[PDB]
């Protein structure tokens, strides 16, 4: 009958677009959504599940991020009615997620295949697993090309932090390309480069991550890695419905990201 | 003790930033928030108020938009416990809102004071009161300068729609400036202009609306109208607390917007 959803009302890209996929897939299978937004607290996560079990909910999707320690918090051990996690901790937990490492490899290998060696990284905030996995993908793509990691500076997902980080990198312009760990930070990188009089991609190539709707309209249109958030929520409903009507715990589904090539990359200049 | 909030989990700018102001003001006065997100339906709005009256909520803020007909829907007439509306219908309803007309006047008068006559408008979607009020501000600013309305094309708040509209305007380039009714549409306008080989502001001036965090990082940094959404939510709590502890229904508060002048405007070329 009904499906519960717990989420966070944040301005970061992803959650609201996942919810569109949940709305679209649940309505197609005859289900309605029971939305209960929470904060970033484990106690509010648990008692949202209790208050959504109060109404006749046949299954609940968790979009609020937890950890790689969901089981060791009396969150998965206590939750035996059908729950799917939109986070990365599968020791037996049915999850669905985007392959962040693979996405960062796509972005970095795109630049390596163009001839770039000095690919700097504007990495995401340390307390996000997605950020840490994207740095690992960038580092290992470079290592497998025989190259040491160039400069890294950490932002916080905002355009402001991408601008500030790029300005610091430009004190030592030892790079021909910048991989920015999301599209918003990439926007700030582009402003720092343009302020310096540097052309994109003629002087410096730039790649982002997310494929937010605005990224095709940056100057220049941004090559980026698409997270298909709507498909993430649709596969969250599809995975949950096997456990509503009764089936085995499925393998943790991993959505491969896609590189969207636009106008912000080129071979390095001579 | 507790304060309830109803809202919508949409990707449009505003709601999540209002919620930051509600969280900050309620925590300062010792209150906690009870969040219940809904869809864009009057029946879900009413029964969210019923299910939030279930928990010991001392007052509830409504961030989900309603209409200019909130009273004639058994929504204000039925709601006698303390409710504040973040919408525009004050026949006796305590509301708080941003002055959309005044903001559009600021944007258009900025361009008129620079010498522009042919100020085209990329207007917002018709079913948003904010969009209709911004068009009225643009039209009346022009009228009070003695000028007829130039070309108008309607978008849908997306950068894509601003790009498509600007491309259509460029089939008849009878404008020296474009007022885009939000910052995202302005981003698409900038791409359409740059694709045409037109310089901003040397060939065409552009003004947006919202002051989203990204707007300072557009190419060029965008002159825009700031909606102080955090102050909107803080004044929503402050207005609600006069009616929790007992006071008269206050006047409908109107927040004046502020023009943020950056690098996207200049006098028209000769």
Max Cα separation, chain B?
Answer: 66
Confirm if A101 and A130 have CB atoms less than 8 A apart: no
Which residue in the block uniquely carries the two structure tokens 């290992």?
A: A140
Q: How many CB atoms lie within 10 A of CB A162?
A: 31
CA angle B79, B80, B85 (to 5 degrees): 60
- CB contacts of A216 in chain B (<8 Å) are 159-160
Breaks (C–N over 2.5 Å) after residues, chain B: none
Sequence-distant (6+) residues with CB within 8 A of A47 are none
A-chain residue closest to B185, CA distance? A214
Tell which residue, A206, A199, A202, has the closest CA to residue A111. Answer: A206
Strands across the sheet containing B205-207: B152-154, B119-123, B177-180, B205-207
Please check whether residue A17 touches B, CB under 8 A.
yes
Max Cα separation, chain A?
Answer: 66
Report the first-to-last Cα separation within chain B, whole angstroms: 63
The span from the CA of A25 to the CA of A23, in Å, is 6
CB contact under 8 A, B158 and A194: no
The span from the CA of A26 to the CA of A4, in Å, is 10
Structure tokens at A65: 């991020």
φ/ψ bin of A120: left (φ > 0), alpha (ψ from -120 to 50), beta (otherwise): beta
- CB contacts of A17 in chain B (<8 Å) are 11
As to burial, measured by CB atoms within 10 angstroms (0-12 exposed, 13-18 middle, 19+ buried), residue A20 is middle
Please check whether residue A208 touches B, CB under 8 A.
no
Confirm if B182 and B13 have CB atoms less than 8 A apart: yes
Resolution in A: 1.7
The span from the CA of A163 to the CA of B18, in Å, is 25
Sequence-distant (6+) residues with CB within 8 A of B21 are B229, B230, B231, B232, B233, B234, B235, B236, B237
Confirm if A4 and A59 have CB atoms less than 8 A apart: yes
- CB contacts of B12 in chain A (<8 Å) are none
Tell which residue, B125, B191, B173, has the closest CA to residue B153. Answer: B125
The span from the CA of A73 to the CA of A67, in Å, is 10
Query: CB pairs below 8 Å between A and B: how many?
Result: 81
Breaks (C–N over 2.5 Å) after residues, chain A: none
Instruction: Tell how far CA A232 is from the center of its chain.
Output: 11
The answer to whether the peptide bond before residue A8 is cis (omega within 30 degrees of 0) is no
The span from the CA of A138 to the CA of A143, in Å, is 9
Sequence-distant (6+) residues with CB within 8 A of B28 are none
Write the DSSP assignment of A121-142 as a string of letters: EEE--TT-HHHHHHHHHHHHHH
CATH second-level architecture of A2-97+228-255? 3-Layer(aba) Sandwich (3.40)
As to burial, measured by CB atoms within 10 angstroms (0-12 exposed, 13-18 middle, 19+ buried), residue B177 is buried
The span from the CA of B121 to the CA of A136, in Å, is 46
Confirm if A217 and B184 have CB atoms less than 8 A apart: no
Q: Return the bridge partners of B57, or none.
A: B2
Please check whether residue B9 touches A, CB under 8 A.
yes
Tell which residue, A130, A21, A218, A14, has the closest CA to residue B214. Answer: A218
CB contact under 8 A, A163 and B9: no
Tell which residue, A188, A123, A192, A187, has the closest CA to residue A154. Answer: A123
Please check whether residue B142 touches A, CB under 8 A.
no
Which residues make up the CATH 3.40.50.2300 domain(s) of chain A? Answer: 2-97+228-255, 100-226
- CB contacts of B188 in chain A (<8 Å) are 217
The span from the CA of A66 to the CA of A252, in Å, is 16
Please check whether residue A8 touches B, CB under 8 A.
no
CATH number of B100-226: 3.40.50.2300
The span from the CA of B58 to the CA of B243, in Å, is 10
Q: Return the bridge partners of A260, or none.
A: A224
DSSP code of B256?
P
The answer to whether the peptide bond before residue B201 is cis (omega within 30 degrees of 0) is yes
DSSP code of A269?
P
Q: How far is CA A166 from CA A85, A112, A134, B218, in A?
A: 35, 20, 18, 15
The span from the CA of A137 to the CA of A206, in Å, is 16
Please check whether residue A11 touches B, CB under 8 A.
yes
Confirm if B21 and B86 have CB atoms less than 8 A apart: no
Contacts by A66-70 with C-beta closer than 8 Å and gap 24+?
A: A66/A42, A68/A129
Instruction: Specify the CATH superfamily of domain B2-98+228-256.
Output: Response regulator (3.40.50.2300)
Tell which residue, B76, B80, B97, B79, has the closest CA to residue B88. Answer: B97
CA angle B10, B13, B18 (to 5 degrees): 90
């Amino acid at each position: 009958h009904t499906i519960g959803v717990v989420t966070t009302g944040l301005s970061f890209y992803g959650p609201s677009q996942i919810l569109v996929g949940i709305e679209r897939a649940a309505r197609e299978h005859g289900y309605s959504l029971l939305l209960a937004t929470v904060h970033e607290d484990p106690d509010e996560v648990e008692e949202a599940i209790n208050t959504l079990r109060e109404r006749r909910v046949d299954g609940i999707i968790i979009v609020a991020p937890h950890n790689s320690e969901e089981e060791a918090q009396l969150a998965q051990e206590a939750g035996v009615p059908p729950v799917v996690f939109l986070s990365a901790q599968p020791p037996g937990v049915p999850t669905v997620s985007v392959d962040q490492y693979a996405g960062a490899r796509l972005a970095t290998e795109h630049l390596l295949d163009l001839g770039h060696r000095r690919i700097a990284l504007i990495t995401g905030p340390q307390d996000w697993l997605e950020a840490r996995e994207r740095l690992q993908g960038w580092r290992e793509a470079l290592a497998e090309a025989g190259l040491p990691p160039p400069a890294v500076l950490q932002g916080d997902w905002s355009a402001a932090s991408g601008y500030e980080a790029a300005r610091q990198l430009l004190e030592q312009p030892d790079f021909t390309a910048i991989f920015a760990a999301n599209d918003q930070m990439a926007l700030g990188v582009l402003r720092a480069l343009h302020e310096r009089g540097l052309r994109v991609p003629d002087d410096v190539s730039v790649v982002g991550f997310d494929d937010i709707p605005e990224s095709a309209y940056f100057h220049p249109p941004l090559t980026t890695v698409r997270q298909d958030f709507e498909e993430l929520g649709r596969q969250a409903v599809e995975q949950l419905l096997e456990m509503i009507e009764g089936e085995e715990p499925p393998p943790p589904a991993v959505l491969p990201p896609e590189l969207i090539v636009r106008e912000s990359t080129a071979p390095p200049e001579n």
